[PDB]
C-alpha cells in the first residue's frame, strides 16, 4: 500500500529558540 | 493495527518560527519551482516578478577515450629458443 504524506513529519532540528523568523 | 512508515532524506527546508518559538509552517525547497523561489527569497509570500533560483547544467553521460601499435618485445625474451648460463 501507499499513502501521500502531505506536509507531515517536520521536526524541530536543533533545540534553539527562534522567534518570528524564517530559518532555512 | 495500521501504521505508516516513511524515509528521511537530506533535504533543505524553510521553517517558519512563530512569536512563541514554535514551528507553524514549512517549505520544501525542492518540491516545485515556487518553493525554490520561496527558499531563495527566504519568504513565504513572493511578489510578482522573475526570480533566479538555480543553475541548470547538463551532465555528461559517457566517456569516450591512435591505433595502439607498439608494444615492446618480450616474445623474443620469454619464448626464446635458447638462453645463456
Amino acid at each position: 500500500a501507499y499513502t501521500n504524506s502531505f506536509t507531515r513529519g517536520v521536526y524541530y532540528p536543533d533545540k534553539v529558540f527562534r522567534s518570528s523568523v524564517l530559518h532555512s | 493495527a495500521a501504521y505508516y512508515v516513511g524515509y528521511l532524506q537530506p533535504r533543505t527546508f524553510l521553517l517558519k518560527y512563530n512569536e512563541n518559538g514554535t514551528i507553524t509552517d514549512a517549505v520544501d525547497c525542492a518540491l516545485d519551482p515556487l518553493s525554490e523561489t520561496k527558499c531563495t527569497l527566504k519568504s513565504f509570500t513572493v511578489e510578482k516578478g522573475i526570480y533566479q533560483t538555480s543553475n541548470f547544467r547538463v551532465q555528461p553521460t559517457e566517456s569516450i577515450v591512435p591505433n595502439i601499435t607498439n608494444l615492446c618485445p618480450f616474445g623474443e625474451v620469454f619464448n626464446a629458443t635458447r638462453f645463456a648460463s
Binding site: 524541530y12 534553539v16 529558540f17 527562534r18 | 512563541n20
Partner: protein
C-alpha cells in the same frame, strides 16, 4: 560568550536551550539548574570622539 545577562520574558519551549537572532547570534540562553530564560546583551562599546 561574553555579555550582560538580564532577566527576560521570552517564553522558550521546554526543550529549547538557547535563543538566537536573525543573524544567527545567540541573544538568549536558558540557564540550567533553575530554567530561567536569560537575555544576552553585548558589553557596551562605541567610539570615543
Amino acid at each position: 560568550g561574553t555579555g550582560v545577562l538580564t532577566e527576560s520574558n521570552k517564553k522558550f519551549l521546554p526543550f529549547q536551550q538557547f535563543g538566537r537572532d536573525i543573524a544567527d547570534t545567540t541573544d538568549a540562553v536558558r540557564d540550567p539548574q533553575t530554567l530561567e530564560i536569560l537575555d544576552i546583551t553585548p558589553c557596551s562599546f562605541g567610539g570615543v570622539s
